[PDB]
């Protein structure tokens, strides 16, 4: 029992069509290994200034016979500064024809995100706190846990195939693994945090140099680019020619010339001899205006986002606390086994 779900490559994010409520109201929502809560855009939400938050489906709680309004205020904040607020509730959620009942979600009535988010990370990382960090509501069974608990999958686990940079679609598989879509063997890596799907990154090879790292990296489907501590990012920027630019009082971004040569690869070395090779096309990102970002950016948090993850096949196992990885093989061939 595996559940395949199509991932829409939207550019900066990968989203899936899911349904919510007794009347199966279609929501197109970001598939996010970096958050743990599922929220939907209320049909009467107030979007953030300049944000078209109602173009990817909306949810009307009043037309679902099964919708339960829990008492409780919902608030979440993301790495890029975006936020959502609303109220906690429960309803039926349907994923590629497979329904789960009484799933706790948030009904969002204000958001600066473009669409809803389906957070599928650890339950310990749920957004169950007020602004000051006081816990306001209990931790609860999020979507992957509920899939397991209601007998839809055997193990709280999922495989991620973002597919190639040009592809319109990829696939996420809850409770299974597509053994046709990688070369070599999946190498199991220990998850190093009890809250975040992070594994140890031993080193990064770029432009003929090996840069020792030895710290955790978040494998985040819901991040576009790749983020590293400032000093490590600066070491890589030195080989690549990326230049740091101050864009706000506290924000700095690496820019790079749009016509920069993109031959060569960047290699990421993990535990147990696991290795992911990323083509350097992944490190030039086109902005609207004729400038480009470098695909690595500085941050206190280390995150391998989509520009990395497109080049790996990943089996996240939240029960075993492992993420198993192998170099991706882009193919329509498919041979899925349950996990």
């Amino acid at each position: 029992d595996s559940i395949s779900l199509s991932l829409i490559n939207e550019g900066p994010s990968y989203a899936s069509k899911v349904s919510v409520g007794s009347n199966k109201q279609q929501q197109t929502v970001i598939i996010d290994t970096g958050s743990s809560d599922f929220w939907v855009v209320d049909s009467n939400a107030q979007c953030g200034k300049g944000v078209d938050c109602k173009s990817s489906g909306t949810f009307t709680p009043s037309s679902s016979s099964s919708y339960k309004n829990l008492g409780a205020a919902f608030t979440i904040r993301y790495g890029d500064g975006s936020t959502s607020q609303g109220t906690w509730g429960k309803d039926t959620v349907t994923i590629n024809g497979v329904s789960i009942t009484g799933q706790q979600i948030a009904d969002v009535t204000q958001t600066s995100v473009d669409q809803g988010i389906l957070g599928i990370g650890y339950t310990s990382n749920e957004a169950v706190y007020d602004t000051s960090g006081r816990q306001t509501t209990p931790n609860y069974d999020n979507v992957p846990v509920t899939l397991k608990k209601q007998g839809k999958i055997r193990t709280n686990a999922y495989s991620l195939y973002l597919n190639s940079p040009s592809a319109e679609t990829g696939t996420i598989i809850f409770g299974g693994v597509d053994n046709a879509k990688y070369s070599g063997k999946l190498v199991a890596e220990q998850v190093t945090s009890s809250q975040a799907l992070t594994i140890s990154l031993a080193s990064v090879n770029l432009k003929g140099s090996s840069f020792s790292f030895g710290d955790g990296a978040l494998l985040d489907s819901g991040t576009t680019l790749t983020y590293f501590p400032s000093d490590f990012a600066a070491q890589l920027a030195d080989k690549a020619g990326a230049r740091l630019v101050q864009v706000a009082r506290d924000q700095y971004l690496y820019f790079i010339d749009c016509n920069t040569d993109t031959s060569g690869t960047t290699v990421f070395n993990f535990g147990n001899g696991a290795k992911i090779t990323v083509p350097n096309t992944e490190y030039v990102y086109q902005n609207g205006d004729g400038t480009c970002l470098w695909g690595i950016q500085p941050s206190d948090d280390t995150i391998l986002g989509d520009n990395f993850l497109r080049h790996a096949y990943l089996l996240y196992n939240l029960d075993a606390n492992t993420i198993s990885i192998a170099q991706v093989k882009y193919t329509t061939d498919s041979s899925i086994s349950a996990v």
Partner: peptide, 5 residues
Amino acid sequence: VVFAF
């Protein structure tokens, strides 16, 4: 984008 806290 960069998805929690």
